[PDB]
Tab-separated table of C-alpha atoms and ligand atoms in Angstrom:
chain	number	residue	atom	x	y	z
A	1	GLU	CA	102.405	92.549	101.297
A	2	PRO	CA	103.179	95.167	98.563
A	3	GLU	CA	99.873	96.401	96.971
A	4	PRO	CA	100.216	96.571	93.142
A	5	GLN	CA	98.642	99.313	91.023
A	6	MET	CA	95.560	98.252	88.981
A	7	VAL	CA	97.739	96.531	86.286
A	8	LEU	CA	95.193	93.621	86.293
A	9	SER	CA	92.075	95.686	85.483
A	10	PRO	CA	88.674	94.249	84.532
A	11	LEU	CA	87.736	94.774	80.847
A	12	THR	CA	87.357	98.498	80.024
A	13	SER	CA	86.019	99.961	76.738
A	14	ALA	CA	87.883	103.342	76.970
A	15	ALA	CA	91.462	104.426	77.729
A	16	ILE	CA	93.603	107.474	77.706
A	17	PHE	CA	97.372	106.946	77.250
A	18	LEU	CA	99.344	110.028	78.345
A	19	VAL	CA	103.169	110.083	77.931
A	20	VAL	CA	105.021	113.207	79.123
A	21	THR	CA	108.647	114.240	79.726
A	22	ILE	CA	109.667	115.993	82.948
A	23	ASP	CA	110.959	119.537	82.316
A	24	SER	CA	114.238	120.634	83.935
A	25	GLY	CA	113.250	121.592	87.520
A	26	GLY	CA	109.859	119.755	87.354
A	27	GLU	CA	110.998	116.837	89.633
A	28	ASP	CA	109.476	118.216	92.909
A	29	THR	CA	106.014	118.826	91.292
A	30	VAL	CA	106.112	115.293	89.762
A	31	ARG	CA	106.985	113.699	93.160
A	32	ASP	CA	104.012	115.548	94.838
A	33	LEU	CA	101.596	114.347	92.090
A	34	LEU	CA	102.890	110.722	92.300
A	35	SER	CA	101.974	110.666	96.044
A	36	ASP	CA	98.403	111.952	95.208
A	37	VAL	CA	97.557	109.920	92.049
A	38	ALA	CA	95.607	107.147	93.958
A	39	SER	CA	93.624	109.892	95.870
A	40	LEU	CA	92.745	111.553	92.512
A	41	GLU	CA	91.705	108.176	90.994
A	42	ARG	CA	89.234	107.719	93.959
A	43	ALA	CA	87.972	111.337	93.841
A	44	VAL	CA	87.169	111.105	90.088
A	45	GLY	CA	85.901	107.499	90.023
A	46	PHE	CA	84.037	106.866	93.291
A	47	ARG	CA	80.851	108.789	92.361
A	48	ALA	CA	80.631	106.782	89.052
A	49	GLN	CA	81.043	103.310	90.831
A	50	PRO	CA	80.484	100.430	90.425
A	51	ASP	CA	80.174	100.675	86.580
A	52	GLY	CA	82.837	103.434	86.050
A	53	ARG	CA	85.764	100.947	86.585
A	54	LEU	CA	88.164	103.970	86.507
A	55	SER	CA	91.866	103.108	87.175
A	56	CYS	CA	95.203	104.831	86.495
A	57	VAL	CA	98.496	102.929	86.201
A	58	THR	CA	101.493	105.292	86.537
A	59	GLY	CA	104.800	104.350	84.946
A	60	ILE	CA	108.309	105.878	85.330
A	61	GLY	CA	111.010	105.660	82.646
A	62	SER	CA	114.709	104.742	83.260
A	63	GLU	CA	116.155	108.287	82.874
A	64	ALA	CA	113.247	109.827	84.879
A	65	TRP	CA	113.788	107.243	87.674
A	66	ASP	CA	117.402	108.521	88.175
A	67	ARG	CA	116.170	112.165	88.221
A	68	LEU	CA	113.358	111.469	90.768
A	69	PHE	CA	114.805	108.872	93.185
A	70	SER	CA	118.079	107.934	94.852
A	71	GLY	CA	119.265	104.460	95.869
A	72	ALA	CA	118.290	101.098	94.405
A	73	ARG	CA	116.573	100.921	90.987
A	74	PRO	CA	114.364	98.159	89.547
A	75	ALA	CA	116.677	95.425	88.173
A	76	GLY	CA	115.288	95.543	84.550
A	77	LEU	CA	114.680	99.311	84.154
A	78	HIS	CA	116.430	100.657	81.023
A	79	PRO	CA	115.446	102.830	78.058
A	80	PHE	CA	113.385	101.125	75.346
A	81	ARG	CA	115.859	99.179	73.086
A	82	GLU	CA	115.532	100.268	69.390
A	83	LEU	CA	115.325	97.241	67.024
A	84	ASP	CA	116.777	97.795	63.508
A	85	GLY	CA	115.557	94.824	61.476
A	86	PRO	CA	116.304	94.220	57.768
A	87	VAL	CA	112.778	95.564	56.853
A	88	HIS	CA	111.042	96.829	60.079
A	89	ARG	CA	112.266	99.163	62.881
A	90	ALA	CA	111.002	99.621	66.450
A	91	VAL	CA	111.840	103.274	67.266
A	92	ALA	CA	112.518	104.541	70.798
A	93	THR	CA	110.772	107.857	71.548
A	94	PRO	CA	111.036	110.070	74.623
A	95	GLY	CA	108.864	109.343	77.684
A	96	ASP	CA	109.509	109.875	81.402
A	97	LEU	CA	105.997	109.254	82.779
A	98	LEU	CA	103.090	107.087	81.560
A	99	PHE	CA	99.533	107.432	82.765
A	100	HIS	CA	97.499	104.425	81.537
A	101	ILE	CA	93.956	105.521	82.324
A	102	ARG	CA	91.087	103.052	81.764
A	103	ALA	CA	87.350	103.121	82.456
A	104	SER	CA	84.002	101.999	81.010
A	105	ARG	CA	83.567	105.597	79.602
A	106	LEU	CA	85.998	108.110	77.998
A	107	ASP	CA	84.643	111.019	80.140
A	108	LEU	CA	85.944	109.399	83.422
A	109	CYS	CA	89.377	108.904	81.730
A	110	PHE	CA	89.317	112.510	80.511
A	111	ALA	CA	88.297	113.922	83.970
A	112	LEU	CA	91.216	112.090	85.664
A	113	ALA	CA	93.708	113.075	82.888
A	114	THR	CA	92.564	116.728	83.417
A	115	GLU	CA	93.221	116.565	87.208
A	116	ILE	CA	96.700	114.936	86.686
A	117	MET	CA	97.772	117.371	83.923
A	118	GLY	CA	96.360	120.305	85.965
A	119	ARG	CA	98.778	119.353	88.822
A	120	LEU	CA	101.761	118.927	86.379
A	121	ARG	CA	101.278	122.171	84.309
A	122	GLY	CA	104.692	123.884	83.975
A	123	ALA	CA	106.608	120.735	85.157
A	124	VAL	CA	106.076	118.439	82.104
A	125	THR	CA	105.772	118.495	78.305
A	126	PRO	CA	103.230	116.176	76.608
A	127	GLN	CA	104.806	113.734	74.140
A	128	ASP	CA	101.769	111.532	73.309
A	129	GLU	CA	98.042	111.518	74.082
A	130	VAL	CA	95.820	108.767	72.660
A	131	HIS	CA	92.085	108.319	73.366
A	132	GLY	CA	91.403	104.625	72.864
A	133	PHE	CA	88.037	102.905	72.277
A	134	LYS	CA	87.440	99.130	72.029
A	135	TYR	CA	85.069	97.757	69.316
A	136	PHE	CA	81.841	96.326	70.827
A	137	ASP	CA	83.168	92.698	70.186
A	138	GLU	CA	86.775	93.247	71.403
A	139	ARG	CA	88.093	93.663	67.785
A	140	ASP	CA	91.082	95.819	66.909
A	141	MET	CA	91.493	98.023	63.829
A	142	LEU	CA	92.538	94.908	61.767
A	143	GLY	CA	89.094	93.358	62.529
A	144	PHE	CA	90.558	90.584	64.749
A	145	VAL	CA	89.494	89.885	68.342
A	146	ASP	CA	92.326	91.248	70.467
A	147	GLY	CA	92.959	90.053	74.064
A	148	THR	CA	91.805	86.426	73.738
A	149	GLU	CA	95.014	84.696	74.960
A	150	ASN	CA	95.822	87.228	77.750
A	151	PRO	CA	96.584	85.331	80.992
A	152	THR	CA	93.823	85.605	83.705
A	153	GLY	CA	93.750	85.413	87.555
A	154	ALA	CA	96.775	83.733	89.203
A	155	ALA	CA	98.534	83.119	85.874
A	156	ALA	CA	98.245	86.905	85.142
A	157	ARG	CA	99.637	87.903	88.602
A	158	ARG	CA	102.608	85.510	88.140
A	159	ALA	CA	103.289	86.879	84.556
A	160	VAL	CA	103.079	90.632	85.358
A	161	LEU	CA	104.018	91.295	89.054
A	162	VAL	CA	107.697	91.573	90.207
A	163	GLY	CA	108.292	89.058	93.067
A	164	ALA	CA	111.291	87.615	94.975
A	165	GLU	CA	113.699	88.082	91.945
A	166	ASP	CA	113.712	91.844	92.806
A	167	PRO	CA	112.306	92.012	96.339
A	168	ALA	CA	112.695	95.814	96.949
A	169	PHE	CA	110.375	96.362	93.924
A	170	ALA	CA	107.884	93.481	94.519
A	171	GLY	CA	104.369	94.355	93.269
A	172	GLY	CA	105.702	96.476	90.388
A	173	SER	CA	105.555	95.683	86.680
A	174	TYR	CA	107.212	96.751	83.415
A	175	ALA	CA	105.085	98.396	80.695
A	176	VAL	CA	106.217	98.666	77.054
A	177	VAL	CA	104.083	101.009	74.888
A	178	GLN	CA	104.202	101.333	71.106
A	179	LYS	CA	101.792	103.400	69.004
A	180	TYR	CA	101.156	101.496	65.746
A	181	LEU	CA	99.558	103.001	62.622
A	182	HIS	CA	98.053	100.467	60.197
A	183	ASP	CA	98.002	100.574	56.423
A	184	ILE	CA	94.298	99.625	56.232
A	185	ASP	CA	94.242	99.988	52.387
A	186	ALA	CA	97.001	97.327	52.065
A	187	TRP	CA	95.338	95.123	54.737
A	188	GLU	CA	91.832	95.218	53.114
A	189	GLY	CA	93.508	94.103	49.853
A	190	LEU	CA	94.106	90.653	51.430
A	191	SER	CA	91.443	87.895	51.442
A	192	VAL	CA	90.147	86.951	54.928
A	193	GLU	CA	92.143	83.629	54.657
A	194	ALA	CA	95.368	85.611	53.905
A	195	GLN	CA	94.666	87.934	56.942
A	196	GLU	CA	94.108	84.780	59.091
A	197	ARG	CA	97.573	83.493	57.920
A	198	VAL	CA	99.091	86.888	59.050
A	199	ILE	CA	97.505	86.716	62.566
A	200	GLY	CA	97.284	82.900	63.104
A	201	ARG	CA	93.610	82.827	64.178
A	202	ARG	CA	90.261	82.651	62.294
A	203	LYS	CA	88.860	86.166	61.816
A	204	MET	CA	85.114	85.727	62.639
A	205	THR	CA	85.284	82.871	65.210
A	206	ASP	CA	88.744	83.656	66.811
A	207	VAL	CA	89.766	79.946	66.877
A	208	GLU	CA	93.563	79.489	66.675
A	209	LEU	CA	94.809	77.937	63.366
A	210	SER	CA	96.047	74.298	63.767
A	211	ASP	CA	99.857	73.897	64.220
A	212	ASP	CA	100.034	72.343	60.677
A	213	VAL	CA	98.418	75.390	58.846
A	214	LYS	CA	99.684	78.212	61.187
A	215	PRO	CA	102.601	79.929	59.388
A	216	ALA	CA	105.982	80.359	61.157
A	217	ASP	CA	105.793	84.135	60.432
A	218	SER	CA	102.208	84.548	61.759
A	219	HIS	CA	101.795	86.938	64.694
A	220	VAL	CA	100.624	84.256	67.171
A	221	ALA	CA	103.536	81.945	66.138
A	222	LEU	CA	106.226	84.635	66.723
A	223	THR	CA	104.762	85.940	70.055
A	224	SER	CA	104.380	82.356	71.438
A	225	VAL	CA	107.610	81.910	73.472
A	226	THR	CA	108.638	79.150	75.920
A	227	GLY	CA	111.349	79.437	78.599
A	228	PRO	CA	114.345	77.056	78.987
A	229	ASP	CA	112.243	75.064	81.502
A	230	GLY	CA	109.270	74.553	79.080
A	231	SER	CA	106.870	77.181	80.626
A	232	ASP	CA	104.956	79.703	78.430
A	233	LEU	CA	106.354	83.250	78.825
A	234	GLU	CA	103.221	85.438	78.922
A	235	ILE	CA	102.493	89.179	78.961
A	236	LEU	CA	99.290	91.060	79.719
A	237	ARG	CA	98.153	93.301	76.852
A	238	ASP	CA	95.443	95.910	76.658
A	239	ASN	CA	95.750	96.964	72.999
A	240	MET	CA	93.418	99.878	72.168
A	241	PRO	CA	92.192	101.107	68.782
A	242	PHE	CA	92.419	104.827	68.085
A	243	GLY	CA	92.342	107.052	65.069
A	244	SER	CA	91.109	109.998	63.021
A	245	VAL	CA	88.874	109.333	60.004
A	246	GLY	CA	89.742	112.649	58.272
A	247	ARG	CA	93.544	112.054	58.512
A	248	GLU	CA	93.058	108.318	57.562
A	249	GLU	CA	94.860	107.454	60.815
A	250	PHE	CA	93.886	103.961	62.019
A	251	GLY	CA	95.996	102.651	64.888
A	252	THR	CA	96.585	100.114	67.615
A	253	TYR	CA	98.029	101.443	70.842
A	254	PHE	CA	100.069	98.513	72.150
A	255	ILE	CA	100.723	98.200	75.905
A	256	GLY	CA	102.259	94.983	77.314
A	257	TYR	CA	102.885	94.414	81.025
A	258	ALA	CA	105.415	91.801	82.241
A	259	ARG	CA	107.381	91.122	85.491
A	260	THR	CA	110.608	91.542	83.449
A	261	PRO	CA	111.185	93.508	80.193
A	262	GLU	CA	113.092	90.398	78.951
A	263	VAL	CA	109.789	88.623	78.097
A	264	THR	CA	108.338	91.597	76.118
A	265	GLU	CA	111.737	92.295	74.470
A	266	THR	CA	112.136	88.609	73.395
A	267	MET	CA	108.717	88.890	71.656
A	268	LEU	CA	109.700	92.239	70.064
A	269	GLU	CA	113.041	90.723	68.804
A	270	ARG	CA	111.209	87.761	67.191
A	271	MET	CA	108.715	90.200	65.595
A	272	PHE	CA	111.216	92.814	64.271
A	273	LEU	CA	114.405	90.695	63.698
A	274	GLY	CA	112.709	87.321	63.059
A	275	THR	CA	113.993	83.742	63.623
A	276	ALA	CA	115.489	80.797	61.640
A	277	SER	CA	111.969	80.095	60.176
A	278	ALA	CA	110.583	83.645	59.797
A	279	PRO	CA	112.026	86.897	58.368
A	280	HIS	CA	109.709	88.956	60.655
A	281	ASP	CA	106.134	89.125	61.954
A	282	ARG	CA	103.771	89.532	58.952
A	283	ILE	CA	101.620	91.949	61.137
A	284	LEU	CA	104.432	94.542	60.677
A	285	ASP	CA	103.894	94.547	56.847
A	286	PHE	CA	100.617	96.396	57.744
A	287	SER	CA	101.657	98.076	61.029
A	288	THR	CA	104.250	100.831	61.603
A	289	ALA	CA	105.488	101.597	65.148
A	290	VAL	CA	105.790	105.410	65.587
A	291	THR	CA	106.505	105.396	69.367
A	292	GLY	CA	108.334	103.074	71.721
A	293	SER	CA	108.842	103.570	75.490
A	294	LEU	CA	109.489	101.390	78.558
A	295	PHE	CA	108.256	102.202	82.065
A	296	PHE	CA	108.382	100.665	85.491
A	297	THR	CA	104.998	100.778	87.244
A	298	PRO	CA	105.835	100.654	90.976
A	299	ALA	CA	103.721	99.066	93.726
A	300	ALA	CA	100.932	101.522	94.836
A	301	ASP	CA	102.521	101.753	98.349
A	302	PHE	CA	105.832	102.912	96.756
A	303	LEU	CA	104.025	105.978	95.252
A	304	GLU	CA	102.029	106.649	98.482
A	305	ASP	CA	105.241	106.848	100.663
A	306	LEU	CA	107.003	109.668	98.628
B	401	HEM	C1	100.796	95.875	65.989
B	401	HEM	C2	99.699	95.902	66.652
B	401	HEM	C3	99.284	94.640	67.318
B	401	HEM	C4	98.122	94.053	67.017
B	401	HEM	C5	97.061	94.713	66.173
B	401	HEM	C6	98.064	92.810	67.710
B	401	HEM	C7	96.991	91.934	67.627
B	401	HEM	C8	96.914	90.700	68.215
B	401	HEM	C9	95.898	89.735	67.995
B	401	HEM	C10	94.678	89.955	67.134
B	401	HEM	C11	96.189	88.637	68.726
B	401	HEM	C12	95.379	87.353	68.754
B	401	HEM	C13	94.329	87.238	69.829
B	401	HEM	C14	94.939	87.488	71.181
B	401	HEM	O1	95.004	88.644	71.633
B	401	HEM	O2	95.305	86.498	71.814
B	401	HEM	C15	97.412	88.907	69.383
B	401	HEM	C16	98.032	88.012	70.198
B	401	HEM	C17	99.225	88.335	70.823
B	401	HEM	N1	99.989	89.446	70.637
B	401	HEM	FE1	99.707	90.908	69.359
B	401	HEM	N2	99.208	92.640	68.395
B	401	HEM	C18	100.030	93.682	68.166
B	401	HEM	C19	101.284	93.883	68.684
B	401	HEM	C20	101.901	93.052	69.595
B	401	HEM	C21	103.200	93.245	70.204
B	401	HEM	C22	104.043	94.462	69.900
B	401	HEM	C23	103.440	92.166	71.066
B	401	HEM	C24	104.592	91.846	71.950
B	401	HEM	C25	105.641	92.579	72.120
B	401	HEM	C26	102.273	91.322	70.949
B	401	HEM	C27	102.094	90.157	71.663
B	401	HEM	C28	101.014	89.315	71.512
B	401	HEM	C29	100.899	88.089	72.279
B	401	HEM	C30	101.822	87.613	73.321
B	401	HEM	C31	99.765	87.448	71.870
B	401	HEM	C32	99.213	86.144	72.358
B	401	HEM	C33	99.932	85.051	71.543
B	401	HEM	C34	99.514	83.693	72.052
B	401	HEM	O3	100.077	83.203	73.006
B	401	HEM	O4	98.520	83.106	71.620
B	401	HEM	N3	101.367	91.907	70.076
B	401	HEM	N4	97.855	90.181	69.048
B	402	MG	MG1	95.819	104.388	52.820
């Protein structure tokens, strides 16, 4: 059986997202680190178990894949597709490697990030570093509970893990990241009932709005997608708040895992380009994407065998 990376993590209250590019000539150093990342995760995390819940998911971008590896590629691995809507744009920004580091405490994330970046010094250039923290009641920076409809258990494994459709890459996943900044001043100008019509759920109690009050351009309406065969197309999210009070920077770091980028990209198209019923996702009137990258997160045994 292929052993996946810790894509399906228990709930964690802290994250570091590290996105780097590989410098010309840095390939050999990167390949050595990829074969050691699971060993480093154990070295940093074991002595803080069982409450540390430290994990690192490592992702490789399309262009980086072709620099690092020869032979067969994951079937759906391509650069993030830029979406140029009438009003809103999803930008593509550079990123060769993703380290999605999660734990119950920021210090465990930081210790592992330090070991990884120590091994990659001189081989990579940092593009993005975000220290994420969840609100004590799973709220995001818009004050809504965030994670509620994530798939769990068997449903989550079926939604996120590559299987027989791409058998050489079984146990992998596709991660799409986007750093969003929120216009909190504009958002806080709305009544709670208007905010609820933007999201599609009740703010305090997190109960979904009935189908007869839920707007067509609400977030939950546009990211609810069914396949030709009537099944829900699901992704696994672990959205993390971040920011800087002095710079008035209030953000949501979006990460969505799926067994094919097609599911995440269908949701992004509905959000950014809209549908018959909806010009675009109302969440984007208060949320600006400033990064956008796609990564393949290989099976753990793929990284071990380099
Ligand atoms: C802009 C920052 C984002 C924020 C603050 C945000 C926030 C939320 C919130 C509050 C919910 C409702 C509760 C729940 O998690 O089930 C939700 C649901 C969801 N979001 Fe977003 N989200 C963002 C971006 C995205 C993006 C970019 C995608 C997909 C590409 C996405 C996909 C989903 C999905 C699939 C659901 C569950 C819908 C359902 O089936 O009920 N989100 N999000
Ligand atoms: Mg402002």
